Design a protein around this motif. Structure first.
Motif, PDB file in Angstrom:
ATOM      1  N   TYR A  24       1.016  -1.355   0.037  1.00  0.00           N
ATOM      2  CA  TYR A  24      -0.271  -0.539   0.599  1.00  0.00           C
ATOM      3  C   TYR A  24       0.794   1.311   0.000  1.00  0.00           C
ATOM      4  CZ  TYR A  24      -3.937   3.238   1.120  1.00  0.00           C
ATOM      5  OH  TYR A  24      -4.851   3.588   0.956  1.00  0.00           O
ATOM      6  N   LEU A  28       0.813   4.041  -3.007  1.00  0.00           N
ATOM      7  CA  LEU A  28       0.382   5.528  -2.793  1.00  0.00           C
ATOM      8  C   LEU A  28       1.489   6.612  -2.826  1.00  0.00           C
ATOM      9  CD1 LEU A  28      -0.979   5.241   0.732  1.00  0.00           C
ATOM     10  CD2 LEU A  28      -2.124   5.941  -0.974  1.00  0.00           C
ATOM     11  N   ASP A  51      -7.651  -4.769  -4.215  1.00  0.00           N
ATOM     12  CA  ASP A  51      -8.167  -4.213  -3.042  1.00  0.00           C
ATOM     13  C   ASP A  51      -6.964  -3.183  -3.075  1.00  0.00           C
ATOM     14  OD1 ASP A  51      -9.316  -2.783  -1.486  1.00  0.00           O
ATOM     15  OD2 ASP A  51      -8.228  -3.605   0.122  1.00  0.00           O
ATOM     16  N   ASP A  54      -8.123  -0.640  -6.952  1.00  0.00           N
ATOM     17  CA  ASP A  54      -8.905   0.273  -6.960  1.00  0.00           C
ATOM     18  C   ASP A  54      -8.275   1.681  -6.240  1.00  0.00           C
ATOM     19  OD1 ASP A  54     -10.275  -2.097  -6.812  1.00  0.00           O
ATOM     20  OD2 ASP A  54     -11.108  -2.155  -4.908  1.00  0.00           O
ATOM     21  N   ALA A  55      -7.125   1.589  -5.841  1.00  0.00           N
ATOM     22  CA  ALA A  55      -6.313   3.129  -4.949  1.00  0.00           C
ATOM     23  C   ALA A  55      -5.249   3.352  -6.537  1.00  0.00           C
ATOM     24  CB  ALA A  55      -4.974   2.460  -4.442  1.00  0.00           C
ATOM     25  N   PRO A  57      -6.257   4.288  -9.693  1.00  0.00           N
ATOM     26  CA  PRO A  57      -6.946   5.879 -10.358  1.00  0.00           C
ATOM     27  C   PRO A  57      -6.666   7.031  -9.320  1.00  0.00           C
ATOM     28  CG  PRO A  57      -8.569   4.423 -10.264  1.00  0.00           C
ATOM     29  CD  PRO A  57      -7.521   3.443  -9.436  1.00  0.00           C
ATOM     30  N   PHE A  58      -6.055   6.628  -8.161  1.00  0.00           N
ATOM     31  CA  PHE A  58      -5.852   8.152  -6.865  1.00  0.00           C
ATOM     32  C   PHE A  58      -4.893   8.475  -6.794  1.00  0.00           C
ATOM     33  CE2 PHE A  58      -9.730   6.304  -6.002  1.00  0.00           C
ATOM     34  CZ  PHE A  58     -10.418   7.698  -5.872  1.00  0.00           C
ATOM     35  N   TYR A 235       2.983  -0.127  10.287  1.00  0.00           N
ATOM     36  CA  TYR A 235       3.014   1.583   9.763  1.00  0.00           C
ATOM     37  C   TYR A 235       4.190   1.604   9.421  1.00  0.00           C
ATOM     38  CZ  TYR A 235      -2.037   1.055   9.244  1.00  0.00           C
ATOM     39  OH  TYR A 235      -3.613   0.577   9.342  1.00  0.00           O
TER      40      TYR A 235
ATOM     41  N   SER D  20      -6.115   2.632   7.992  1.00  0.00           N
ATOM     42  CA  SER D  20      -5.654   3.182   6.738  1.00  0.00           C
ATOM     43  C   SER D  20      -5.937   4.049   6.280  1.00  0.00           C
ATOM     44  CB  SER D  20      -5.983   1.778   5.586  1.00  0.00           C
ATOM     45  OG  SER D  20      -6.013   0.138   5.834  1.00  0.00           O
ATOM     46  N   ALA D  24      -2.764   6.726   5.387  1.00  0.00           N
ATOM     47  CA  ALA D  24      -2.848   6.764   3.600  1.00  0.00           C
ATOM     48  C   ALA D  24      -2.806   8.527   3.728  1.00  0.00           C
ATOM     49  CB  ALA D  24      -4.334   6.777   3.111  1.00  0.00           C
ATOM     50  N   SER D 144     -17.526   7.328  -5.632  1.00  0.00           N
ATOM     51  CA  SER D 144     -15.869   7.150  -5.529  1.00  0.00           C
ATOM     52  C   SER D 144     -15.381   6.078  -5.733  1.00  0.00           C
ATOM     53  CB  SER D 144     -15.453   8.912  -4.140  1.00  0.00           C
ATOM     54  OG  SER D 144     -15.869   7.679  -3.617  1.00  0.00           O
ATOM     55  N   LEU D 145     -15.635   4.552  -4.587  1.00  0.00           N
ATOM     56  CA  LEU D 145     -14.688   4.122  -4.670  1.00  0.00           C
ATOM     57  C   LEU D 145     -15.272   2.907  -5.948  1.00  0.00           C
ATOM     58  CD1 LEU D 145     -12.780   1.670  -3.837  1.00  0.00           C
ATOM     59  CD2 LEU D 145     -14.547   1.318  -2.420  1.00  0.00           C
ATOM     60  N   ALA D 148     -13.702   4.622  -9.269  1.00  0.00           N
ATOM     61  CA  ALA D 148     -12.447   4.031  -9.093  1.00  0.00           C
ATOM     62  C   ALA D 148     -12.395   2.474  -9.715  1.00  0.00           C
ATOM     63  CB  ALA D 148     -11.480   4.509  -8.132  1.00  0.00           C
ATOM     64  N   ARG D 149     -13.110   1.388  -9.052  1.00  0.00           N
ATOM     65  CA  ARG D 149     -13.039  -0.148  -9.460  1.00  0.00           C
ATOM     66  C   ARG D 149     -13.116   0.464 -11.445  1.00  0.00           C
ATOM     67  NH1 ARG D 149     -15.497  -1.999  -4.160  1.00  0.00           N
ATOM     68  NH2 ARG D 149     -14.195  -2.671  -2.919  1.00  0.00           N
ATOM     69  N   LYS D 216     -17.495  -6.755  -6.844  1.00  0.00           N
ATOM     70  CA  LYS D 216     -16.184  -6.701  -5.969  1.00  0.00           C
ATOM     71  C   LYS D 216     -15.834  -6.490  -4.744  1.00  0.00           C
ATOM     72  CE  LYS D 216     -11.716  -5.505  -7.806  1.00  0.00           C
ATOM     73  NZ  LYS D 216     -11.427  -3.916  -7.674  1.00  0.00           N
ATOM     74  N   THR D 227     -12.796  -5.247   2.741  1.00  0.00           N
ATOM     75  CA  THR D 227     -12.136  -4.249   1.759  1.00  0.00           C
ATOM     76  C   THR D 227     -11.945  -3.041   2.372  1.00  0.00           C
ATOM     77  OG1 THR D 227     -13.395  -2.972   0.777  1.00  0.00           O
ATOM     78  CG2 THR D 227     -14.002  -5.180   0.623  1.00  0.00           C
ATOM     79  N   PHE D 228      -9.889  -2.434   2.112  1.00  0.00           N
ATOM     80  CA  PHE D 228     -10.535  -1.419   2.392  1.00  0.00           C
ATOM     81  C   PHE D 228      -8.915  -0.692   1.969  1.00  0.00           C
ATOM     82  CE2 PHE D 228      -6.310  -3.906   4.105  1.00  0.00           C
ATOM     83  CZ  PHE D 228      -7.188  -4.927   4.749  1.00  0.00           C
ATOM     84  N   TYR D 229      -8.580  -1.128   1.596  1.00  0.00           N
ATOM     85  CA  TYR D 229      -7.613   0.211   0.746  1.00  0.00           C
ATOM     86  C   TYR D 229      -7.893   0.752  -0.534  1.00  0.00           C
ATOM     87  CZ  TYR D 229      -3.425  -3.162   2.748  1.00  0.00           C
ATOM     88  OH  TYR D 229      -2.996  -3.905   3.396  1.00  0.00           O
ATOM     89  N   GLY D 230      -9.293   0.437  -1.204  1.00  0.00           N
ATOM     90  CA  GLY D 230      -9.543   1.077  -2.173  1.00  0.00           C
ATOM     91  C   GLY D 230     -10.439   2.589  -1.524  1.00  0.00           C
ATOM     92  N   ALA D 232      -9.686   3.834   1.430  1.00  0.00           N
ATOM     93  CA  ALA D 232      -8.826   4.750   2.499  1.00  0.00           C
ATOM     94  C   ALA D 232      -8.498   5.347   1.088  1.00  0.00           C
ATOM     95  CB  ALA D 232      -7.966   3.933   3.309  1.00  0.00           C
ATOM     96  N   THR D 233      -7.859   4.651   0.289  1.00  0.00           N
ATOM     97  CA  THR D 233      -7.601   6.021  -0.963  1.00  0.00           C
ATOM     98  C   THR D 233      -8.339   6.818  -1.494  1.00  0.00           C
ATOM     99  OG1 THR D 233      -6.183   3.793  -1.310  1.00  0.00           O
ATOM    100  CG2 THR D 233      -6.145   6.172  -2.575  1.00  0.00           C
ATOM    101  N   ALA D 234      -9.516   5.932  -1.635  1.00  0.00           N
ATOM    102  CA  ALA D 234     -10.763   7.690  -1.684  1.00  0.00           C
ATOM    103  C   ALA D 234     -10.696   8.492  -0.585  1.00  0.00           C
ATOM    104  CB  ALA D 234     -11.576   6.645  -2.416  1.00  0.00           C
ATOM    105  N   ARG D 237      -7.671  10.965  -1.046  1.00  0.00           N
ATOM    106  CA  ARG D 237      -8.833  12.445  -1.559  1.00  0.00           C
ATOM    107  C   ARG D 237      -9.068  13.037  -1.706  1.00  0.00           C
ATOM    108  NH1 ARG D 237      -8.171  15.868  -4.074  1.00  0.00           N
ATOM    109  NH2 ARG D 237      -8.620  15.370  -6.766  1.00  0.00           N
TER     110      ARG D 237
END
Lengths: 315, 315, 306, 306
Positions: A24, A28, A51, A54-55, A57-58, A235, D20, D24, D144-145, D148-149, D216, D227-230, D232-234, D237
């Motif tokens: 991750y 990032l 999973d 999915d990050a 696109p950002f 972390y 997460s 981030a 948003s997620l 992104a997916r 998904k 599920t968490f990374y997606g 969290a990142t959103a 953002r």
């Protein structure tokens, strides 16, 4: 085209909390363009891969997928986070044999794939497994790197930073030795913005000597504290691994505390142990040898000695 | 070690305001690890090199120096910003011959050095000099890239962004054609967050058609406006060059408007002209062919035609 | 409450330095608004709209040609307006200063002054005097740039990332500045300890290294007319430290209230900086030689102030 | 005035998502303070001090185990606290909501609520109702997620950076969400136009692509538990867009005041967001099929709200 080589690839072995968080962090911060994730639990790795996708696109693009050891053929970087924990009633020697068996079944298929990069090792006990990885891989000393005391150093810097109320990036202090109970602080060269800890205490005598001793003890025990509170730690080490990865992949010639091979430094030999080192795209360039006080040098010797006895016995 | 190839090197040819700003942008954003600066004025390049070095302690490391064409041997990227300006009373054909003479004396020593990377061309007139660079270098079509209409597109997006009060990164609109007077906006596919300009105007009829026409005219004339006001333009193009560099060096497969070789697209052939394209470490992968309206296709044809007549005459 | 999450910088002086500073701020996405103020209203319009073209490739910003009155609600006022030794510019630049600080304060500006015009430690003092702002909200770039030059110089020599090299130049920015070799180090290892391990490095090399640093501006001007990338980058670093409340340690022009035995001047020393300006002034314990240098630098500086 | 350049986020819920999200925020240096609030006071202490270890490699932050009262001066309150279909969680999560929003408002909190707990569009509405905050200062992650997916899915297929792919999922986040193929595109070229140029891409592939996107979360939970990374990142953002006042366009849970013929619900649509929350709601002109989907999604959503 020579620019065909501008594609950076990391194979991550071990998808526990540490490996997953490392992936991750890499996503990032947009470090490397490809991450292959290898673990005995194939479902879990598929799960993390998609999973993490999915990050993207950002952030910057990456090819991320559940991988096999054969996928390391053209990797720049192999990061090993897969170590079996010490069960109660095992000796350190037993923890070491259990993990050598495993580490063999990773390093051998990786080398056989054609991998010709750098090994970055973070599995515990890290300085031992770093040595093992060198022994099993046949790679040069300087292309096998352990996280060593990078994390303890970060903890130490943050700890001091909080105390004096300063950005931890302006705090420069090391923990060296074997990562674990025999590690020790290098107070003699520790400083804040160039001003040494000795000099700082003189200016600010509110800061009692016992506080500083507790600060270090707390750092040494920080993993235990974290595990007590939330089950595992990840972390910090993830972030450190990303930092090291960035230093290699961007050819930084950065100074970091790392598990490196001793060829005489501190009067030590034929072990990996934690010390400041210069690192770049080709792995370890220099090993900095901090001139230690007598107390500090003793600590380094004790740390190295127990460490070395365990290595010898293990082979 | 395969990681020996994790060192990225850019040779910049031309140290005017554009080249100098491009170098600064690369430094500030930590793109590439080495920048060699080549220009007939050796003192000026030494001057920039060592002024830029002062920025490094605040950013990532880089080897920056005054360079020679022979330093391109192992470069990933050769960026050409050296074009002679059109003097009053010269024809476009004359500007083109004057610059071909110069461009030859760059491209030939570069190729002779062993350079085996990507040419990124920004000297004006850019679509012509991009073609020239391809012709003189013998490199593949897709490893010779011009900035084309990337800058006009940015100007166009920012212009719309200001009008509707939205982050320009959420505005998607192109300028295509030859960079210069015959370029044209692609209103048919322009949009803000997916909503087309047509649809946006319908929702917001305060926005009159004539405003949009003026907006484009202002974009086309923006260079002239800037030169009127401050003598030269450079921040925009520098930034665009850095963006393109990042896309190549990090293997992004990014879509950008660029000078690319026409092999049938839009009914065009054997010229470089500006259109959206996918770019990565190996240069141009795809050329996107936007389905244009009749008006828009006419504009593209007119732009290509005058451009092509000038190329033929020049050889 | 989030209405206050909009950061605004007024930049005064649109020469090469100010223009480069603006570009740096744009590229690194520091602050959301930049107003540019200069005598030459056409040139500032020209830069504003040239810089806007970069925004689609970075974060958003409001960038425009500005007036002193636009500083009413600014977080930050950055003064780069100088005439083109750095002391030989003092009277010419005070005259310009005078015409800036008054209208800025009169606008209602209630932020931090960041001063980079030369001679910087003098103009910083001047800016404090003319503005009536607190000591710690008037900050000069001081020896941040010389320090960066020094670090980079060392870094090249030992082949190490300059961010792992820790060494200061202190004093007045200019001819009387001096290196603090006693505390200079690479990854914690001092320069003394480094030379012992690497005797290829001769003592006269280190002396030359510093002399070259002290003359670097002159070398750059000889070669290309002006210097700007370094200072611009430093100003961006300082701006980031304030605007993100970092508590970062940087060498800066700060007010002496006893430190090093000095008083009632601004001079260059390591300091902690955050959203409220200067929090601490670090007082490096200098050697006798080093302390002498600091005293001479300060003495000569105080004479010129009068 | 620069005293206000300190940004503070209170995160409520320290599961995998919240944890997460915090990481981030740390890694990307967004905000200067993060307070973590959860039932499990030991777990939040544990995360706070594990995250602190990352700070020497990033920008500084105050990170700590927090109480609802710590939100008094926060810019941002992010709610991730859920029970472990996303609708089958509604009553369990309203109960938890209730216990959060009241003490937060009572603290004096006067910022923006960012809601990510499932079912998100319902809990966003709930949060608005319970808090009494303005419509535009209560924001849900919405689709948003999923968007992104969707983008990433397309991106992989056509082998292009997802940032050059522009396509939305709108509606209620969950089973009744739908793709907006009519306006989906890659570098401006629509999906329709793309398929025409690349007929290897069969229509049934695109349908599967969307179905896979809609399922998904379930696929990820099947494979690895949560599920968490997606998300969290959103959330990071969205936080960045608010805290840097971006006026960015993002798909979010926003209040319908007539748009698409809808009223008095939060549902997912493109919107412009900045330091003051929602500025505009973009109303995409949908096809008949697409508008039907939006209506069904909204209808079913409004039933459940009651």
């Amino acid at each position: 085209s020579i620019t065909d080589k501008d594609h950076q690839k990391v194979i991550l072995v071990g998808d526990g909390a540490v490996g997953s968080s490392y992936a991750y962090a890499m996503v990032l911060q947009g470090i490397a363009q490809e991450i292959g994730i290898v673990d005995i639990f194939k479902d879990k790795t598929k799960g993390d891969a998609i999973d993490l996708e999915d990050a993207l696109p950002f952030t910057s693009p990456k090819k991320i997928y559940s991988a096999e050891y054969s996928d390391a053929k053209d990797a720049d970087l192999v990061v090993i986070t897969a170590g079996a924990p010490q069960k109660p009633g095992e000796t350190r020697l037993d923890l070491v044999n259990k993990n050598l068996k495993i580490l063999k079944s990773i390093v051998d298929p990786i080398v056989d794939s054609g991998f010709n990069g750098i090994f970055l090792v973070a599995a515990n006990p890290v300085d031992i497994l770093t040595y093992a990885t060198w022994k099993l891989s046949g790679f040069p000393k300087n292309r096998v790197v352990g996280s060593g005391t990078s994390l303890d150093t970060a903890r130490f810097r943050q700890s001091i930073a909080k105390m004096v109320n300063v950005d931890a990036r302006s705090v420069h202090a090391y923990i060296m030795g074997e990562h674990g109970d025999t590690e020790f602080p290098v107070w003699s060269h520790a400083n804040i913005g160039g001003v040494t800890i000795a000099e700082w205490v003189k200016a600010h005598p509110e800061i009692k000597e016992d506080k500083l001793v507790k600060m270090f003890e707390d750092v040494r025990n920080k993993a235990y504290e974290i595990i007590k509170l939330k089950g595992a730690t990840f972390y910090g080490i993830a972030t450190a691994l990303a930092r090291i990865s960035k230093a290699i992949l961007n050819d930084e010639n950065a100074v970091l505390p790392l598990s490196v091979y001793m060829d005489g430094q501190y009067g030590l030999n034929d072990i990996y142990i934690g010390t400041p080192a210069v690192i770049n795209r080709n792995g370890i360039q220099n090993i900095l040898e901090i001139p230690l006080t007598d107390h500090e040098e003793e600590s380094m010797q004790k740390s190295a000695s127990q460490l070395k006895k365990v290595l010898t016995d293990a082979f």
